């Protein structure tokens, strides 16, 4: 109903409701619940044991805790794995005490020492395992729902049963099935995929239904964490629109700084760690100001000056404003250089790269008839010299060197590149004619002694200007 994107952005902000202090700690506790759901669901995964084993191998060569607790508290899950592996895989998979040992392995996981690089690896490995089993189910659906004339409802009732051995394949060749009698015409992909599913199951050491509900718990916890992150970032858009007042200069628009503070607040969500007892606005202020300075350093300038030189030139502008207020006169580079504790040539160098280049549509004249661009000199200049002599000297060499009735002109035209593509040295022109370099040098000196005399090369002499 409007035309400004920032006003309907404010409308979408006003659609959601803000937070009080108790609402802030409630959304922080919802973030904690969304994190800890994945933290306890990953304890039931068999690859977490190998992940903690490679973590113990990484910290073997190593406020903070002592490393002895990292050496001791990263090896009991290996013992639980080697006392569970004789029950979860051997002597049948469907067992109650095997699931009790699985829960015992899961309840000893709280020795986290959380690192954001460590958290990505288990999520990535479980996501590509979920992607592998999902494209396995997708290719099975492509070979069974689309082919052999049976709908999607005749697949899930046999898919949810075992999905381990060959019983589900000839379960789809049921009591009559005249449309699905093509056995060997469809077997060639499905048993090759079932062997891949079986080797995946023997890699994880568990049936496909348990890892299916484990990945469903992963998706549920990730969706709940995403909704908690969404309400956290939506309740704090007043923070970015209230912090974006102090950086409202004419280098960028408002919306780019707002959406950079949005990703700064999104980083501050996972960098919050609310158990210290602080508010989200106070710690998020630093991250959003960092994102705002990063956007005003990378963007808001045609010539992209980096963030450290942006910081030094902002300090130089503040020192120049302070010396303007303390003196009244224009700030010389000497006082700014001695107050910056930097040499003066670096001060003038960062002063040279002062601001965005004058755009092409500024009215430098008296009216709006002639803008900029009608005053720029050509860098690729084509002078009367550069247009006339660059061909007339070529014609003069083609006229004079044609009088050279031997191979000296043929070895001199490739000595510099006249009527040739690649410029050659004496060695490359030697291998064609005269492999000893000094023969070509002596014939070049003879051609020089023939051409340097002001008798017939005076037209070549007049081209020195």
């Amino acid at each position: 109903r409007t035309t400004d994107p920032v006003r309907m952005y404010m409308r979408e902000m006003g659609t959601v409701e803000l937070l009080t202090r108790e609402g802030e700690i409630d959304i922080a506790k919802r973030i904690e619940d969304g994190i800890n759901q994945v933290q306890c669901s990953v304890a039931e995964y068999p690859e977490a044991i190998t992940y903690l084993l490679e973590q113990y191998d990484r910290v073997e060569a190593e406020n903070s805790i002592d490393p002895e607790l990292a050496r001791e508290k990263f090896a009991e899950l290996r013992a639980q794995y080697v006392v569970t592996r004789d029950t979860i895989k051997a002597k049948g998979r469907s067992h109650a005490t095997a699931q009790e040992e699985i829960l015992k392995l899961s309840e000893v996981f709280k020795q986290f020492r959380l690192v954001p690089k460590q958290f990505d690896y288990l999520v990535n490995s479980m996501r590509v395992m979920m992607d592998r089993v999902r494209t396995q189910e997708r290719l099975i659906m492509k070979l069974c729902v689309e082919q052999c004339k049976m709908p999607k409802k005749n697949f899930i009732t046999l898919f949810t049963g075992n999905e381990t051995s060959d019983t589900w394949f000839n379960a789809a060749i049921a009591m009559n099935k005249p449309w699905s009698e093509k056995l060997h015409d469809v077997s060639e992909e499905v048993h090759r995929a079932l062997q891949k599913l079986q080797q995946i199951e023997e890699e994880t050491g568990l049936t496909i239904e348990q890892v299916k509900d484990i990945n469903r718990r992963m998706s549920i916890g990730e969706a709940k964490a995403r909704r908690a992150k969404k309400e956290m970032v939506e309740a704090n858009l007043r923070l970015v629109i209230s912090i974006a007042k102090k950086y409202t200069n004419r280098g960028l628009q408002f919306l780019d700084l707002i959406q950079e503070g949005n990703i700064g607040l999104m980083k501050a969500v996972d960098k919050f760690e609310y158990r210290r007892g602080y508010k989200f606005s106070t710690y998020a202020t630093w991250w959003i100001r960092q994102a705002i300075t990063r956007s005003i350093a990378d963007q808001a300038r045609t010539i992209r000056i980096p963030v450290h030189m942006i910081e030094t030139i902002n300090k130089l502008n503040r020192i120049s404003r302070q010396m303007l207020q303390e003196m009244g006169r224009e700030p010389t580079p000497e006082e700014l250089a001695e107050r910056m504790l930097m040499p003066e040539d670096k001060i003038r160098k960062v002063l040279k790269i002062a601001k965005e280049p004058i755009s092409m549509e500024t009215p430098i004249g008296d009216d709006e008839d002639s803008h900029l661009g009608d005053f720029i000199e050509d860098t690729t200049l084509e002078l009367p010299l550069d247009s006339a002599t660059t061909e007339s000297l070529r014609a003069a060499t083609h006229d004079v060197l044609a009088g050279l009735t031997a191979r000296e002109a043929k070895v001199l035209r490739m000595r510099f590149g006249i009527d040739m593509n690649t410029d050659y040295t004496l060695e490359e022109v030697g291998k064609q004619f005269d492999v000893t370099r000094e023969r070509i040098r002596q014939i070049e000196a003879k051609a020089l002694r023939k051409l340097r005399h002001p008798s017939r090369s005076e037209v070549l002499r007049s081209f020195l200007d």
């Binding site: 990484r58 060569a61 190593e62 903070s64 690192v115 690089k117 460590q118």
Partner: protein
Amino acid sequence: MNISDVAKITGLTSKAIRFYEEKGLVTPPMRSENGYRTYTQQHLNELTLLRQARQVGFNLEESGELVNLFNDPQRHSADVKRRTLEKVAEIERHIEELQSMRDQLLALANACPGDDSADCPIIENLS
């Protein structure tokens, strides 16, 4: 446990230990899965030992040969003692040649306190 705060505690700079990390001088620490590097207290002991070796006037090759036999239970202190003896013998040879230059030169430059006359007997005798 990072490298520049430990350099500020030990009195060093980060450029020196980064140049030691560039060559084969300091043992490479494990990456802390970020844009930083952690230090073992044994690595800090090797760092301050190499700083004490460089501050007194040892060349960095012989101090590297000292820190290669550091933080290990072998620690042979006879061949490296002979190597440091050859190092200070080369240092004393440098001292001997510089003092040879010192008592070779210093008896010829008494007069001519900066006049505009183009006559000096030092350069025509040396060359």
